[PDB]
Design a protein around this ligand. Structure first.
Ligand SMILES: OC[C@H]1O[C@@H](O[C@H]2[C@H](O)[C@H](O)[C@H](O)O[C@@H]2CO)[C@@H](O)[C@@H](O)[C@@H]1O
Ligand SMILES: OC[C@H]1O[C@@H](O[C@H]2[C@H](O)[C@H](O)[C@H](O)O[C@@H]2CO)[C@@H](O)[C@@H](O)[C@@H]1O
Lengths: 323, 310
């Protein structure tokens, strides 16, 4: 079958991940451009051996059951096959990461339905059927393209209690995708997912504030040892902005207030505490755009991207080191 | 407890509307339904379903003077009063989705922050309800995705009891009568009776069993139907078939509801939905698509029920 501990069953293959996320938010026009090719090649200078190909699907509100995918302006199946094959042509292993977003701008962590089925209301059953169609479409693409890993969700906090529905979705994914399955829980939620045993690898969003990494290493170590599964960060990063290090997840904080040093300090601290531990399997960083800004414009860029910034040198020297 | 023959007045709670001369004519006209109670309903506001701060008693919401006016006017007309402060969401999300993570997370709003804000809102109006002699206070309306927060609801009710000495109810949503674990903490159970045409006999049997399991009084804190095509199939859906008038659909809803819910000794009646502070002209009733029954055939079904033998 599939249940296992520290190492996924041989038929699904644990590598130490040196990764960068590519392509977010997933815009067909961006991925089809010439610039996308230059972007992905430049990303390889971080001395990564993995990339997460990340893109969005959409639902209207946090409480609507229908998810749309692979329609304008979202990525086409051809754009996705292109990105996977290009990555593999550059020597990278691939995590496919389909992520549902909400058109009204609500954070997907609030997607939620009543516990009680009510006749005139949307139900969990209707949303999970729609989510299953979305994730099974990309699980089949992941299989066809040889993606080493599939991430079956990202910080879906207010769905995680629906344990039978998550287990049922995973059983369907297993029937069409034979590689490694992970789920990406949100920051602070590593001990709150009751169904970690149903995936191959645990992962979370490492957006822990400056000054907290030593505490989180100790907290996470105990959680991972209690589950006896491999663990890595499926996202970790910080914008190059004033005070972003105190809330590295907050992509809306202090827009246009540039601070290259804040991003650098975040990375130095994260790598000081998370490195070679036998129970830890590395970093999928956040993030790198399909259309990359000019090196000359990097000192004025307020994004998560490390291209042209001091943090890039911290990452490169960590990923090419003997830790 | 009293058998409630009620109509909700003043929603959505607009200071300008309540301060107008028309508000007085509206509440007087409402008394011709042969009601003995009114629910004085008005909104408080939060930005989103996941924000912790509730604003109240600021423009364009009702002033404390507007609220004292409405309560005293109702009482001057011989009505008992339910005070019904209702939180709404500025972005238009239904309040039943107001919700926070079960786990407190440093960079996220918490249940503790929202309940503190909700407590400030409800305790402001609980004190007004005490000062004005309101017979009942309704401490919430269809707050479905908060109801699991049992310790925080009980703590709020303990605070309300210290400042308000009248009857307390909580208004659960349609189909949720058996889902609230803390009914013991209020005096009277209530729900939103928006059950579709063809379902009332079924719901009478369902609700009877729930109420007899709890051994508490029960009544509908809301019940009504817009005068619109097919509204009877989803009487709660205030956005359905706007401007498609059907006086008969509303009448048929009321006739069925009163056929199955009437004099049962475990049942304590109806607070209907609703009646506006600014009432349309009788000549315009035939073209009005609201819940309001004024000038419509359903008003005569209500009057004949409220003045009847049963
Ligand atoms: O959702 C669109 C925004 O995403 C941001 O990154 C988020 C992302 O949703 C992700 O899944 C993760 O958990 O947090 C990331 C950082 O907060 C940014 O890329 C932003 O530019 C997008 O608008
Ligand atoms: O919330 C504003 C709308 O309320 C509607 O009535 C609702 C109301 O919110 C109430 O609490 C209840 O549970 O359902 C009622 C009927 O659907 C209408 O009055 C509408 O006009 C308002 O815009």
């Amino acid at each position: 079958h599939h249940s296992s501990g520290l190492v996924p069953r041989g038929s699904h293959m644990m590598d130490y991940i040196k990764g960068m996320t590519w392509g977010w938010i997933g815009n067909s026009e961006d991925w089809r451009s010439n610039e996308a090719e230059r972007s992905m090649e430049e990303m390889t200078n971080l001395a990564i051996n993995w990339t997460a190909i990340a893109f969005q699907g959409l639902q209207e509100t946090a409480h609507s059951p229908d998810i749309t995918f692979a329609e304008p302006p979202m990525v086409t199946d051809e754009n996705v096959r292109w990105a996977i094959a290009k990555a593999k042509s550059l020597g990278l292993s691939v995590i496919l990461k389909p992520i549902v977003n909400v058109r009204d701008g609500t954070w997907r962590a609030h997607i939620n339905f009543f516990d009680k089925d009510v006749p005139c209301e949307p139900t969990w059953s209707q949303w999970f059927k729609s989510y299953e169609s979305f994730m099974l479409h990309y699980a089949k693409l992941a299989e066809d393209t040889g993606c080493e890993m599939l991430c079956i969700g990202c910080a879906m906090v207010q769905t995680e209690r629906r344990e039978k529905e998550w287990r049922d979705l995973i059983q369907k994914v297993r029937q069409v995708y034979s590689g490694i399955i992970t789920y990406n829980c949100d920051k602070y939620q590593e001990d709150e997912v009751t169904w970690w045993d149903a995936v191959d690898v645990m992962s979370s969003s490492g957006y822990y504030p400056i000054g907290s990494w030593e505490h989180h290493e100790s907290r996470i170590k105990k959680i991972v040892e209690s589950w006896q599964k491999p663990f890595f960060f499926m996202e970790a990063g910080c914008p190059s902005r004033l005070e972003s290090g105190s809330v590295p997840n907050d992509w809306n904080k202090n827009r246009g207030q540039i601070d290259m040093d804040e991003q650098r300090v975040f990375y130095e601290e994260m790598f000081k505490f998370f490195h070679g531990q036998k129970w830890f399997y590395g970093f999928m960083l956040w993030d790198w755009p399909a259309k990359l800004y000019r090196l000359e414009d990097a000192s004025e860029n307020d994004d998560y991207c490390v291209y042209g910034k001091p943090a890039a040198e911290v990452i490169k020297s960590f990923f090419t080191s003997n830790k």
